């Protein structure tokens, strides 16, 4: 059914968690954010899970961030679940 959680993919590898939190906060209030990193190098894997406070905000993220041009990359954004953001 509906979800507060989205995935955000194709993120430039140099984007920080702070930057992605700013991008998402613009869309709406964020209550959790998990950026994926390589366990050894710490290098970004170029995707994240974001949980918004409400359903309107996650829907807005899917609408506004899917295909959003961030530097040279085109973001992908769709619905995810509690399982994804919890690991």
PDB file of N, CA, C and O in Angstrom:
ATOM      1  N   UNK A   1       0.832  -1.251   0.000  1.00  0.00           N
ATOM      2  CA  UNK A   1       0.000   0.000   0.000  1.00  0.00           C
ATOM      3  C   UNK A   1       0.842   1.267   0.000  1.00  0.00           C
ATOM      4  O   UNK A   1       1.972   1.265  -0.539  1.00  0.00           O
ATOM      5  N   UNK A   2       0.325   2.354   0.607  1.00  0.00           N
ATOM      6  CA  UNK A   2       1.104   3.597   0.638  1.00  0.00           C
ATOM      7  C   UNK A   2       2.352   3.455   1.495  1.00  0.00           C
ATOM      8  O   UNK A   2       2.410   2.576   2.378  1.00  0.00           O
ATOM      9  N   UNK A   3       3.350   4.299   1.236  1.00  0.00           N
ATOM     10  CA  UNK A   3       4.607   4.242   1.980  1.00  0.00           C
ATOM     11  C   UNK A   3       5.207   5.617   2.189  1.00  0.00           C
ATOM     12  O   UNK A   3       5.173   6.455   1.291  1.00  0.00           O
ATOM     13  N   UNK A   4       5.784   5.813   3.370  1.00  0.00           N
ATOM     14  CA  UNK A   4       6.586   7.013   3.674  1.00  0.00           C
ATOM     15  C   UNK A   4       8.042   6.902   3.197  1.00  0.00           C
ATOM     16  O   UNK A   4       8.783   7.893   3.248  1.00  0.00           O
ATOM     17  N   UNK A   5       8.450   5.709   2.750  1.00  0.00           N
ATOM     18  CA  UNK A   5       9.831   5.448   2.406  1.00  0.00           C
ATOM     19  C   UNK A   5      10.022   5.420   0.895  1.00  0.00           C
ATOM     20  O   UNK A   5       9.226   4.816   0.166  1.00  0.00           O
ATOM     21  N   UNK A   6      11.088   6.078   0.438  1.00  0.00           N
ATOM     22  CA  UNK A   6      11.498   6.064  -0.959  1.00  0.00           C
ATOM     23  C   UNK A   6      12.942   5.627  -1.069  1.00  0.00           C
ATOM     24  O   UNK A   6      13.731   5.772  -0.124  1.00  0.00           O
ATOM     25  N   UNK A   7      13.282   5.081  -2.228  1.00  0.00           N
ATOM     26  CA  UNK A   7      14.671   4.950  -2.607  1.00  0.00           C
ATOM     27  C   UNK A   7      15.009   6.110  -3.529  1.00  0.00           C
ATOM     28  O   UNK A   7      14.156   6.628  -4.277  1.00  0.00           O
ATOM     29  N   UNK A   8      16.267   6.518  -3.459  1.00  0.00           N
ATOM     30  CA  UNK A   8      16.823   7.522  -4.334  1.00  0.00           C
ATOM     31  C   UNK A   8      18.115   6.943  -4.903  1.00  0.00           C
ATOM     32  O   UNK A   8      19.075   6.683  -4.160  1.00  0.00           O
ATOM     33  N   UNK A   9      18.126   6.730  -6.215  1.00  0.00           N
ATOM     34  CA  UNK A   9      19.241   6.097  -6.909  1.00  0.00           C
ATOM     35  C   UNK A   9      19.865   6.986  -7.958  1.00  0.00           C
ATOM     36  O   UNK A   9      19.343   8.050  -8.279  1.00  0.00           O
ATOM     37  N   UNK A  10      20.982   6.523  -8.505  1.00  0.00           N
ATOM     38  CA  UNK A  10      21.772   7.273  -9.490  1.00  0.00           C
ATOM     39  C   UNK A  10      22.261   8.604  -8.941  1.00  0.00           C
ATOM     40  O   UNK A  10      22.441   9.555  -9.694  1.00  0.00           O
ATOM     41  N   UNK A  11      22.523   8.640  -7.634  1.00  0.00           N
ATOM     42  CA  UNK A  11      23.023   9.831  -6.962  1.00  0.00           C
ATOM     43  C   UNK A  11      24.490   9.967  -7.322  1.00  0.00           C
ATOM     44  O   UNK A  11      25.214   8.971  -7.270  1.00  0.00           O
ATOM     45  N   UNK A  12      24.936  11.188  -7.699  1.00  0.00           N
ATOM     46  CA  UNK A  12      26.380  11.387  -7.891  1.00  0.00           C
ATOM     47  C   UNK A  12      27.184  10.849  -6.706  1.00  0.00           C
ATOM     48  O   UNK A  12      26.816  11.057  -5.554  1.00  0.00           O
ATOM     49  N   UNK A  13      28.279  10.158  -7.004  1.00  0.00           N
ATOM     50  CA  UNK A  13      29.017   9.447  -5.971  1.00  0.00           C
ATOM     51  C   UNK A  13      29.686  10.399  -4.982  1.00  0.00           C
ATOM     52  O   UNK A  13      30.014  10.005  -3.865  1.00  0.00           O
ATOM     53  N   UNK A  14      29.843  11.655  -5.378  1.00  0.00           N
ATOM     54  CA  UNK A  14      30.437  12.654  -4.499  1.00  0.00           C
ATOM     55  C   UNK A  14      29.433  13.383  -3.593  1.00  0.00           C
ATOM     56  O   UNK A  14      29.830  14.168  -2.742  1.00  0.00           O
ATOM     57  N   UNK A  15      28.143  13.090  -3.737  1.00  0.00           N
ATOM     58  CA  UNK A  15      27.146  13.709  -2.888  1.00  0.00           C
ATOM     59  C   UNK A  15      27.229  13.171  -1.468  1.00  0.00           C
ATOM     60  O   UNK A  15      27.319  11.954  -1.240  1.00  0.00           O
ATOM     61  N   UNK A  16      27.179  14.095  -0.513  1.00  0.00           N
ATOM     62  CA  UNK A  16      27.194  13.757   0.901  1.00  0.00           C
ATOM     63  C   UNK A  16      25.802  13.549   1.453  1.00  0.00           C
ATOM     64  O   UNK A  16      24.803  13.927   0.845  1.00  0.00           O
ATOM     65  N   UNK A  17      25.743  12.936   2.624  1.00  0.00           N
ATOM     66  CA  UNK A  17      24.486  12.710   3.305  1.00  0.00           C
ATOM     67  C   UNK A  17      23.823  14.045   3.629  1.00  0.00           C
ATOM     68  O   UNK A  17      22.614  14.173   3.541  1.00  0.00           O
ATOM     69  N   UNK A  18      24.629  15.037   3.993  1.00  0.00           N
ATOM     70  CA  UNK A  18      24.114  16.385   4.248  1.00  0.00           C
ATOM     71  C   UNK A  18      23.417  16.975   3.032  1.00  0.00           C
ATOM     72  O   UNK A  18      22.366  17.602   3.162  1.00  0.00           O
ATOM     73  N   UNK A  19      24.025  16.793   1.862  1.00  0.00           N
ATOM     74  CA  UNK A  19      23.494  17.331   0.614  1.00  0.00           C
ATOM     75  C   UNK A  19      22.169  16.659   0.258  1.00  0.00           C
ATOM     76  O   UNK A  19      21.211  17.321  -0.138  1.00  0.00           O
ATOM     77  N   UNK A  20      22.130  15.338   0.397  1.00  0.00           N
ATOM     78  CA  UNK A  20      20.917  14.581   0.081  1.00  0.00           C
ATOM     79  C   UNK A  20      19.805  14.897   1.083  1.00  0.00           C
ATOM     80  O   UNK A  20      18.645  15.013   0.698  1.00  0.00           O
ATOM     81  N   UNK A  21      20.161  15.089   2.354  1.00  0.00           N
ATOM     82  CA  UNK A  21      19.176  15.516   3.335  1.00  0.00           C
ATOM     83  C   UNK A  21      18.600  16.897   2.972  1.00  0.00           C
ATOM     84  O   UNK A  21      17.413  17.119   3.104  1.00  0.00           O
ATOM     85  N   UNK A  22      19.444  17.821   2.513  1.00  0.00           N
ATOM     86  CA  UNK A  22      18.947  19.119   2.037  1.00  0.00           C
ATOM     87  C   UNK A  22      18.007  18.970   0.843  1.00  0.00           C
ATOM     88  O   UNK A  22      16.924  19.541   0.834  1.00  0.00           O
ATOM     89  N   UNK A  23      18.364  18.127  -0.124  1.00  0.00           N
ATOM     90  CA  UNK A  23      17.524  17.932  -1.308  1.00  0.00           C
ATOM     91  C   UNK A  23      16.164  17.405  -0.882  1.00  0.00           C
ATOM     92  O   UNK A  23      15.123  17.917  -1.300  1.00  0.00           O
ATOM     93  N   UNK A  24      16.169  16.384  -0.029  1.00  0.00           N
ATOM     94  CA  UNK A  24      14.922  15.766   0.422  1.00  0.00           C
ATOM     95  C   UNK A  24      14.073  16.652   1.335  1.00  0.00           C
ATOM     96  O   UNK A  24      12.844  16.649   1.236  1.00  0.00           O
ATOM     97  N   UNK A  25      14.723  17.414   2.213  1.00  0.00           N
ATOM     98  CA  UNK A  25      14.024  18.328   3.120  1.00  0.00           C
ATOM     99  C   UNK A  25      13.267  19.416   2.365  1.00  0.00           C
ATOM    100  O   UNK A  25      12.228  19.866   2.806  1.00  0.00           O
ATOM    101  N   UNK A  26      13.799  19.829   1.219  1.00  0.00           N
ATOM    102  CA  UNK A  26      13.132  20.758   0.337  1.00  0.00           C
ATOM    103  C   UNK A  26      11.784  20.170  -0.078  1.00  0.00           C
ATOM    104  O   UNK A  26      10.786  20.878  -0.106  1.00  0.00           O
ATOM    105  N   UNK A  27      11.760  18.873  -0.372  1.00  0.00           N
ATOM    106  CA  UNK A  27      10.515  18.197  -0.746  1.00  0.00           C
ATOM    107  C   UNK A  27       9.583  18.126   0.449  1.00  0.00           C
ATOM    108  O   UNK A  27       8.409  18.499   0.353  1.00  0.00           O
ATOM    109  N   UNK A  28      10.114  17.696   1.593  1.00  0.00           N
ATOM    110  CA  UNK A  28       9.337  17.684   2.824  1.00  0.00           C
ATOM    111  C   UNK A  28      10.086  17.127   4.009  1.00  0.00           C
ATOM    112  O   UNK A  28      11.211  16.676   3.874  1.00  0.00           O
ATOM    113  N   UNK A  29       9.452  17.131   5.189  1.00  0.00           N
ATOM    114  CA  UNK A  29      10.137  16.698   6.396  1.00  0.00           C
ATOM    115  C   UNK A  29      10.599  15.250   6.371  1.00  0.00           C
ATOM    116  O   UNK A  29       9.800  14.346   6.099  1.00  0.00           O
ATOM    117  N   UNK A  30      11.874  15.046   6.673  1.00  0.00           N
ATOM    118  CA  UNK A  30      12.508  13.743   6.653  1.00  0.00           C
ATOM    119  C   UNK A  30      12.629  13.231   8.083  1.00  0.00           C
ATOM    120  O   UNK A  30      13.020  13.991   8.971  1.00  0.00           O
ATOM    121  N   UNK A  31      12.286  11.959   8.303  1.00  0.00           N
ATOM    122  CA  UNK A  31      12.410  11.357   9.641  1.00  0.00           C
ATOM    123  C   UNK A  31      13.466  10.258   9.731  1.00  0.00           C
ATOM    124  O   UNK A  31      13.796   9.796  10.827  1.00  0.00           O
ATOM    125  N   UNK A  32      14.011   9.842   8.591  1.00  0.00           N
ATOM    126  CA  UNK A  32      15.179   8.970   8.573  1.00  0.00           C
ATOM    127  C   UNK A  32      15.817   8.981   7.197  1.00  0.00           C
ATOM    128  O   UNK A  32      15.150   9.234   6.185  1.00  0.00           O
ATOM    129  N   UNK A  33      17.119   8.750   7.172  1.00  0.00           N
ATOM    130  CA  UNK A  33      17.874   8.749   5.928  1.00  0.00           C
ATOM    131  C   UNK A  33      19.027   7.784   6.074  1.00  0.00           C
ATOM    132  O   UNK A  33      19.807   7.883   7.039  1.00  0.00           O
ATOM    133  N   UNK A  34      19.131   6.845   5.139  1.00  0.00           N
ATOM    134  CA  UNK A  34      20.210   5.886   5.140  1.00  0.00           C
ATOM    135  C   UNK A  34      20.883   5.897   3.775  1.00  0.00           C
ATOM    136  O   UNK A  34      20.338   5.375   2.818  1.00  0.00           O
ATOM    137  N   UNK A  35      22.065   6.496   3.710  1.00  0.00           N
ATOM    138  CA  UNK A  35      22.884   6.449   2.501  1.00  0.00           C
ATOM    139  C   UNK A  35      23.719   5.170   2.519  1.00  0.00           C
ATOM    140  O   UNK A  35      24.250   4.779   3.571  1.00  0.00           O
ATOM    141  N   UNK A  36      23.837   4.518   1.365  1.00  0.00           N
ATOM    142  CA  UNK A  36      24.580   3.268   1.279  1.00  0.00           C
ATOM    143  C   UNK A  36      26.027   3.540   0.888  1.00  0.00           C
ATOM    144  O   UNK A  36      26.307   4.280  -0.066  1.00  0.00           O
ATOM    145  N   UNK A  37      26.937   2.925   1.641  1.00  0.00           N
ATOM    146  CA  UNK A  37      28.377   3.119   1.481  1.00  0.00           C
ATOM    147  C   UNK A  37      29.075   1.771   1.363  1.00  0.00           C
ATOM    148  O   UNK A  37      28.595   0.756   1.909  1.00  0.00           O
ATOM    149  N   UNK A  38      30.206   1.749   0.666  1.00  0.00           N
ATOM    150  CA  UNK A  38      31.026   0.547   0.648  1.00  0.00           C
ATOM    151  C   UNK A  38      31.618   0.360   2.053  1.00  0.00           C
ATOM    152  O   UNK A  38      32.197   1.288   2.585  1.00  0.00           O
ATOM    153  N   UNK A  39      31.467  -0.841   2.639  1.00  0.00           N
ATOM    154  CA  UNK A  39      31.914  -1.091   4.016  1.00  0.00           C
ATOM    155  C   UNK A  39      33.420  -0.937   4.251  1.00  0.00           C
ATOM    156  O   UNK A  39      33.829  -0.686   5.392  1.00  0.00           O
ATOM    157  N   UNK A  40      34.226  -1.107   3.205  1.00  0.00           N
ATOM    158  CA  UNK A  40      35.683  -1.006   3.350  1.00  0.00           C
ATOM    159  C   UNK A  40      36.234   0.369   3.010  1.00  0.00           C
ATOM    160  O   UNK A  40      36.969   0.962   3.797  1.00  0.00           O
ATOM    161  N   UNK A  41      35.878   0.865   1.831  1.00  0.00           N
ATOM    162  CA  UNK A  41      36.392   2.138   1.344  1.00  0.00           C
ATOM    163  C   UNK A  41      35.594   3.321   1.862  1.00  0.00           C
ATOM    164  O   UNK A  41      36.072   4.454   1.809  1.00  0.00           O
ATOM    165  N   UNK A  42      34.357   3.079   2.310  1.00  0.00           N
ATOM    166  CA  UNK A  42      33.489   4.167   2.736  1.00  0.00           C
ATOM    167  C   UNK A  42      32.945   4.979   1.563  1.00  0.00           C
ATOM    168  O   UNK A  42      32.213   5.952   1.764  1.00  0.00           O
ATOM    169  N   UNK A  43      33.284   4.577   0.338  1.00  0.00           N
ATOM    170  CA  UNK A  43      32.837   5.301  -0.861  1.00  0.00           C
ATOM    171  C   UNK A  43      31.294   5.166  -0.993  1.00  0.00           C
ATOM    172  O   UNK A  43      30.733   4.128  -0.659  1.00  0.00           O
ATOM    173  N   UNK A  44      30.622   6.230  -1.429  1.00  0.00           N
ATOM    174  CA  UNK A  44      29.168   6.181  -1.618  1.00  0.00           C
ATOM    175  C   UNK A  44      28.847   5.126  -2.661  1.00  0.00           C
ATOM    176  O   UNK A  44      29.573   4.968  -3.648  1.00  0.00           O
ATOM    177  N   UNK A  45      27.761   4.386  -2.445  1.00  0.00           N
ATOM    178  CA  UNK A  45      27.240   3.490  -3.468  1.00  0.00           C
ATOM    179  C   UNK A  45      26.255   4.203  -4.422  1.00  0.00           C
ATOM    180  O   UNK A  45      25.728   3.582  -5.342  1.00  0.00           O
ATOM    181  N   UNK A  46      26.004   5.485  -4.187  1.00  0.00           N
ATOM    182  CA  UNK A  46      25.201   6.293  -5.106  1.00  0.00           C
ATOM    183  C   UNK A  46      23.702   6.051  -4.986  1.00  0.00           C
ATOM    184  O   UNK A  46      22.942   6.335  -5.918  1.00  0.00           O
ATOM    185  N   UNK A  47      23.274   5.545  -3.837  1.00  0.00           N
ATOM    186  CA  UNK A  47      21.841   5.461  -3.528  1.00  0.00           C
ATOM    187  C   UNK A  47      21.551   5.516  -2.050  1.00  0.00           C
ATOM    188  O   UNK A  47      22.420   5.297  -1.209  1.00  0.00           O
ATOM    189  N   UNK A  48      20.300   5.833  -1.747  1.00  0.00           N
ATOM    190  CA  UNK A  48      19.854   6.047  -0.398  1.00  0.00           C
ATOM    191  C   UNK A  48      18.404   5.668  -0.252  1.00  0.00           C
ATOM    192  O   UNK A  48      17.656   5.622  -1.239  1.00  0.00           O
ATOM    193  N   UNK A  49      18.029   5.383   0.994  1.00  0.00           N
ATOM    194  CA  UNK A  49      16.638   5.266   1.409  1.00  0.00           C
ATOM    195  C   UNK A  49      16.300   6.446   2.300  1.00  0.00           C
ATOM    196  O   UNK A  49      17.066   6.798   3.202  1.00  0.00           O
ATOM    197  N   UNK A  50      15.149   7.063   2.043  1.00  0.00           N
ATOM    198  CA  UNK A  50      14.702   8.213   2.814  1.00  0.00           C
ATOM    199  C   UNK A  50      13.278   7.951   3.279  1.00  0.00           C
ATOM    200  O   UNK A  50      12.412   7.587   2.475  1.00  0.00           O
ATOM    201  N   UNK A  51      13.052   8.118   4.577  1.00  0.00           N
ATOM    202  CA  UNK A  51      11.703   8.070   5.149  1.00  0.00           C
ATOM    203  C   UNK A  51      11.232   9.483   5.453  1.00  0.00           C
ATOM    204  O   UNK A  51      11.885  10.233   6.190  1.00  0.00           O
ATOM    205  N   UNK A  52      10.099   9.849   4.863  1.00  0.00           N
ATOM    206  CA  UNK A  52       9.484  11.129   5.114  1.00  0.00           C
ATOM    207  C   UNK A  52       8.483  11.013   6.249  1.00  0.00           C
ATOM    208  O   UNK A  52       8.017   9.915   6.565  1.00  0.00           O
ATOM    209  N   UNK A  53       8.188  12.147   6.868  1.00  0.00           N
ATOM    210  CA  UNK A  53       7.255  12.189   7.987  1.00  0.00           C
ATOM    211  C   UNK A  53       5.846  11.802   7.532  1.00  0.00           C
ATOM    212  O   UNK A  53       5.110  11.175   8.291  1.00  0.00           O
ATOM    213  N   UNK A  54       5.496  12.131   6.289  1.00  0.00           N
ATOM    214  CA  UNK A  54       4.145  11.844   5.784  1.00  0.00           C
ATOM    215  C   UNK A  54       4.070  11.380   4.331  1.00  0.00           C
ATOM    216  O   UNK A  54       5.022  11.495   3.548  1.00  0.00           O
ATOM    217  N   UNK A  55       2.903  10.857   3.992  1.00  0.00           N
ATOM    218  CA  UNK A  55       2.643  10.282   2.686  1.00  0.00           C
ATOM    219  C   UNK A  55       2.667  11.280   1.543  1.00  0.00           C
ATOM    220  O   UNK A  55       3.050  10.924   0.433  1.00  0.00           O
ATOM    221  N   UNK A  56       2.256  12.521   1.795  1.00  0.00           N
ATOM    222  CA  UNK A  56       2.299  13.552   0.758  1.00  0.00           C
ATOM    223  C   UNK A  56       3.735  13.831   0.339  1.00  0.00           C
ATOM    224  O   UNK A  56       4.016  13.966  -0.850  1.00  0.00           O
ATOM    225  N   UNK A  57       4.629  13.895   1.325  1.00  0.00           N
ATOM    226  CA  UNK A  57       6.050  14.175   1.074  1.00  0.00           C
ATOM    227  C   UNK A  57       6.777  13.078   0.294  1.00  0.00           C
ATOM    228  O   UNK A  57       7.548  13.391  -0.623  1.00  0.00           O
ATOM    229  N   UNK A  58       6.566  11.805   0.644  1.00  0.00           N
ATOM    230  CA  UNK A  58       7.175  10.715  -0.123  1.00  0.00           C
ATOM    231  C   UNK A  58       6.651  10.682  -1.550  1.00  0.00           C
ATOM    232  O   UNK A  58       7.413  10.463  -2.477  1.00  0.00           O
ATOM    233  N   UNK A  59       5.352  10.931  -1.725  1.00  0.00           N
ATOM    234  CA  UNK A  59       4.766  11.018  -3.060  1.00  0.00           C
ATOM    235  C   UNK A  59       5.352  12.179  -3.862  1.00  0.00           C
ATOM    236  O   UNK A  59       5.654  12.041  -5.057  1.00  0.00           O
ATOM    237  N   UNK A  60       5.516  13.316  -3.204  1.00  0.00           N
ATOM    238  CA  UNK A  60       6.167  14.467  -3.820  1.00  0.00           C
ATOM    239  C   UNK A  60       7.609  14.173  -4.224  1.00  0.00           C
ATOM    240  O   UNK A  60       8.066  14.650  -5.257  1.00  0.00           O
ATOM    241  N   UNK A  61       8.314  13.382  -3.416  1.00  0.00           N
ATOM    242  CA  UNK A  61       9.685  12.984  -3.722  1.00  0.00           C
ATOM    243  C   UNK A  61       9.734  12.113  -4.976  1.00  0.00           C
ATOM    244  O   UNK A  61      10.567  12.323  -5.864  1.00  0.00           O
ATOM    245  N   UNK A  62       8.798  11.176  -5.088  1.00  0.00           N
ATOM    246  CA  UNK A  62       8.748  10.333  -6.259  1.00  0.00           C
ATOM    247  C   UNK A  62       8.488  11.195  -7.525  1.00  0.00           C
ATOM    248  O   UNK A  62       9.141  11.024  -8.554  1.00  0.00           O
ATOM    249  N   UNK A  63       7.550  12.130  -7.410  1.00  0.00           N
ATOM    250  CA  UNK A  63       7.146  13.015  -8.496  1.00  0.00           C
ATOM    251  C   UNK A  63       8.263  13.971  -8.904  1.00  0.00           C
ATOM    252  O   UNK A  63       8.519  14.160 -10.091  1.00  0.00           O
ATOM    253  N   UNK A  64       8.905  14.584  -7.920  1.00  0.00           N
ATOM    254  CA  UNK A  64       9.844  15.671  -8.179  1.00  0.00           C
ATOM    255  C   UNK A  64      11.279  15.201  -8.370  1.00  0.00           C
ATOM    256  O   UNK A  64      12.047  15.812  -9.123  1.00  0.00           O
ATOM    257  N   UNK A  65      11.659  14.140  -7.666  1.00  0.00           N
ATOM    258  CA  UNK A  65      13.039  13.681  -7.723  1.00  0.00           C
ATOM    259  C   UNK A  65      13.308  12.610  -8.769  1.00  0.00           C
ATOM    260  O   UNK A  65      14.438  12.461  -9.194  1.00  0.00           O
ATOM    261  N   UNK A  66      12.302  11.867  -9.208  1.00  0.00           N
ATOM    262  CA  UNK A  66      12.538  10.913 -10.280  1.00  0.00           C
ATOM    263  C   UNK A  66      12.787  11.680 -11.572  1.00  0.00           C
ATOM    264  O   UNK A  66      11.934  12.468 -12.023  1.00  0.00           O
ATOM    265  N   UNK A  67      13.965  11.482 -12.154  1.00  0.00           N
ATOM    266  CA  UNK A  67      14.399  12.260 -13.313  1.00  0.00           C
ATOM    267  C   UNK A  67      15.006  13.613 -13.031  1.00  0.00           C
ATOM    268  O   UNK A  67      15.355  14.353 -13.962  1.00  0.00           O
ATOM    269  N   UNK A  68      15.141  13.961 -11.758  1.00  0.00           N
ATOM    270  CA  UNK A  68      15.766  15.211 -11.381  1.00  0.00           C
ATOM    271  C   UNK A  68      17.240  15.162 -11.772  1.00  0.00           C
ATOM    272  O   UNK A  68      17.915  14.174 -11.495  1.00  0.00           O
ATOM    273  N   UNK A  69      17.715  16.213 -12.431  1.00  0.00           N
ATOM    274  CA  UNK A  69      19.110  16.322 -12.862  1.00  0.00           C
ATOM    275  C   UNK A  69      19.947  16.885 -11.716  1.00  0.00           C
ATOM    276  O   UNK A  69      19.796  18.059 -11.361  1.00  0.00           O
ATOM    277  N   UNK A  70      20.813  16.053 -11.146  1.00  0.00           N
ATOM    278  CA  UNK A  70      21.706  16.448 -10.069  1.00  0.00           C
ATOM    279  C   UNK A  70      23.121  16.266 -10.610  1.00  0.00           C
ATOM    280  O   UNK A  70      23.578  15.138 -10.814  1.00  0.00           O
ATOM    281  N   UNK A  71      23.769  17.393 -10.881  1.00  0.00           N
ATOM    282  CA  UNK A  71      25.018  17.416 -11.639  1.00  0.00           C
ATOM    283  C   UNK A  71      24.840  16.770 -12.996  1.00  0.00           C
ATOM    284  O   UNK A  71      23.933  17.132 -13.758  1.00  0.00           O
ATOM    285  N   UNK A  72      25.691  15.789 -13.290  1.00  0.00           N
ATOM    286  CA  UNK A  72      25.647  15.081 -14.562  1.00  0.00           C
ATOM    287  C   UNK A  72      24.723  13.863 -14.565  1.00  0.00           C
ATOM    288  O   UNK A  72      24.620  13.175 -15.585  1.00  0.00           O
ATOM    289  N   UNK A  73      24.047  13.604 -13.443  1.00  0.00           N
ATOM    290  CA  UNK A  73      23.291  12.370 -13.246  1.00  0.00           C
ATOM    291  C   UNK A  73      21.801  12.665 -13.274  1.00  0.00           C
ATOM    292  O   UNK A  73      21.388  13.776 -12.987  1.00  0.00           O
ATOM    293  N   UNK A  74      21.013  11.656 -13.614  1.00  0.00           N
ATOM    294  CA  UNK A  74      19.553  11.755 -13.517  1.00  0.00           C
ATOM    295  C   UNK A  74      19.121  10.819 -12.401  1.00  0.00           C
ATOM    296  O   UNK A  74      19.325   9.611 -12.482  1.00  0.00           O
ATOM    297  N   UNK A  75      18.543  11.381 -11.348  1.00  0.00           N
ATOM    298  CA  UNK A  75      18.131  10.572 -10.215  1.00  0.00           C
ATOM    299  C   UNK A  75      16.965   9.665 -10.581  1.00  0.00           C
ATOM    300  O   UNK A  75      16.185   9.940 -11.502  1.00  0.00           O
ATOM    301  N   UNK A  76      16.893   8.563  -9.867  1.00  0.00           N
ATOM    302  CA  UNK A  76      15.763   7.664  -9.915  1.00  0.00           C
ATOM    303  C   UNK A  76      15.148   7.715  -8.522  1.00  0.00           C
ATOM    304  O   UNK A  76      15.867   7.734  -7.525  1.00  0.00           O
ATOM    305  N   UNK A  77      13.829   7.785  -8.442  1.00  0.00           N
ATOM    306  CA  UNK A  77      13.150   7.810  -7.144  1.00  0.00           C
ATOM    307  C   UNK A  77      11.841   7.051  -7.267  1.00  0.00           C
ATOM    308  O   UNK A  77      11.045   7.289  -8.200  1.00  0.00           O
ATOM    309  N   UNK A  78      11.640   6.114  -6.356  1.00  0.00           N
ATOM    310  CA  UNK A  78      10.390   5.370  -6.262  1.00  0.00           C
ATOM    311  C   UNK A  78      10.133   4.914  -4.850  1.00  0.00           C
ATOM    312  O   UNK A  78      10.932   5.162  -3.954  1.00  0.00           O
ATOM    313  N   UNK A  79       9.013   4.242  -4.646  1.00  0.00           N
ATOM    314  CA  UNK A  79       8.646   3.822  -3.311  1.00  0.00           C
ATOM    315  C   UNK A  79       9.463   2.616  -2.878  1.00  0.00           C
ATOM    316  O   UNK A  79       9.820   1.748  -3.695  1.00  0.00           O
ATOM    317  N   UNK A  80       9.779   2.623  -1.593  1.00  0.00           N
ATOM    318  CA  UNK A  80      10.495   1.557  -0.927  1.00  0.00           C
ATOM    319  C   UNK A  80       9.668   1.183   0.306  1.00  0.00           C
ATOM    320  O   UNK A  80       8.482   1.509   0.374  1.00  0.00           O
ATOM    321  N   UNK A  81      10.281   0.503   1.270  1.00  0.00           N
ATOM    322  CA  UNK A  81       9.568   0.027   2.456  1.00  0.00           C
ATOM    323  C   UNK A  81      10.385   0.213   3.725  1.00  0.00           C
ATOM    324  O   UNK A  81      11.574   0.537   3.675  1.00  0.00           O
ATOM    325  N   UNK A  82       9.734  -0.018   4.865  1.00  0.00           N
ATOM    326  CA  UNK A  82      10.406  -0.042   6.171  1.00  0.00           C
ATOM    327  C   UNK A  82      11.548  -1.063   6.208  1.00  0.00           C
ATOM    328  O   UNK A  82      12.583  -0.815   6.821  1.00  0.00           O
ATOM    329  N   UNK A  83      11.351  -2.209   5.553  1.00  0.00           N
ATOM    330  CA  UNK A  83      12.382  -3.254   5.470  1.00  0.00           C
ATOM    331  C   UNK A  83      13.674  -2.756   4.822  1.00  0.00           C
ATOM    332  O   UNK A  83      14.780  -3.090   5.273  1.00  0.00           O
ATOM    333  N   UNK A  84      13.536  -1.959   3.767  1.00  0.00           N
ATOM    334  CA  UNK A  84      14.700  -1.442   3.054  1.00  0.00           C
ATOM    335  C   UNK A  84      15.508  -0.479   3.918  1.00  0.00           C
ATOM    336  O   UNK A  84      16.727  -0.618   4.031  1.00  0.00           O
ATOM    337  N   UNK A  85      14.836   0.493   4.530  1.00  0.00           N
ATOM    338  CA  UNK A  85      15.550   1.504   5.316  1.00  0.00           C
ATOM    339  C   UNK A  85      16.081   0.950   6.651  1.00  0.00           C
ATOM    340  O   UNK A  85      17.057   1.471   7.188  1.00  0.00           O
ATOM    341  N   UNK A  86      15.459  -0.112   7.161  1.00  0.00           N
ATOM    342  CA  UNK A  86      15.915  -0.771   8.394  1.00  0.00           C
ATOM    343  C   UNK A  86      17.052  -1.788   8.173  1.00  0.00           C
ATOM    344  O   UNK A  86      17.695  -2.214   9.137  1.00  0.00           O
ATOM    345  N   UNK A  87      17.286  -2.187   6.920  1.00  0.00           N
ATOM    346  CA  UNK A  87      18.383  -3.101   6.580  1.00  0.00           C
ATOM    347  C   UNK A  87      17.960  -4.559   6.496  1.00  0.00           C
ATOM    348  O   UNK A  87      16.976  -4.974   7.119  1.00  0.00           O
TER     349      UNK A  87
END
